[PDB]
Design a protein around this ligand. Structure first.
Ligand SMILES: N[C@@H](CCS)C(=O)O
Ligand SMILES: [Fe+3]
Length: 186
């Protein structure tokens, strides 16, 4: 029985219940993430920006079943085209807007990766992707508003691939945490 998370802390408790088992009910997880109404005071601790690129700020380690983190996107900051390492990715906007562009998995032959679609994710909306669906790029295209998003990955992963839009060629990337539990981790 899914209830509305009253706060970020409550959300986290509910997520621990939803991931108590070995599988993931994706529609339920998405519904509870969507139902949490972003309250900036609750997540200010985690919203640590960098001038030059987006940051990844760990909020909860999910008892090993998932990682919950907050990503902070300066104006004009965005990601590569990337996969999610055979894991679930849920993304909820906490502040601002992000452009999500979807791409198919490339064929072996070198070719421009043509965007399949795009959407603008607005405050409080939750998107979902996994590798069976495809690849995406996430970008804060705003010139005036920083963006903040809440990401849940299950199982946790710290490596993925970035894809060259000109060719489809992939490279392995190791991701890093800007902070963990509110603490900057150089
Ligand atoms: N997976 C990317 C963010 C977009 S989902 C990351 O963890 O930095
Ligand atoms: Fe992603």
């Amino acid at each position: 029985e899914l209830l509305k998370p009253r706060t970020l802390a409550d959300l986290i408790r509910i997520l621990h219940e939803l991931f108590a088992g070995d599988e993931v009910n994706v529609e339920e997880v998405q519904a509870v993430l969507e139902a949490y109404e972003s309250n900036p005071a609750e997540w200010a601790l985690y919203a640590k920006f960098d001038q030059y690129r987006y940051t990844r700020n760990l909020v909860d380690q999910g008892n090993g079943k998932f990682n919950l983190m907050i990503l902070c996107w300066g104006e004009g900051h965005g990601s590569s085209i990337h996969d999610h390492t055979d894991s679930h990715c849920f993304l909820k906007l906490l502040q601002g807007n992000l452009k999500e562009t979807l791409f198919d998995w490339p064929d072996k032959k070198s070719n421009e990766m043509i965007k399949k679609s795009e959407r603008t994710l607005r405050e409080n909306q939750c998107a979902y992707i996994n590798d069976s669906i495809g690849l995406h790029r996430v970008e804060n295209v705003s010139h005036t508003e920083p963006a903040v998003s809440l990401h849940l990955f299950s199982p946790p992963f710290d490596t993925c691939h970035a894809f060259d839009q000109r060719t489809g060629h992939k490279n392995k990337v190791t991701m890093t945490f800007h902070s963990k539990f509110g603490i900057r981790t150089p």
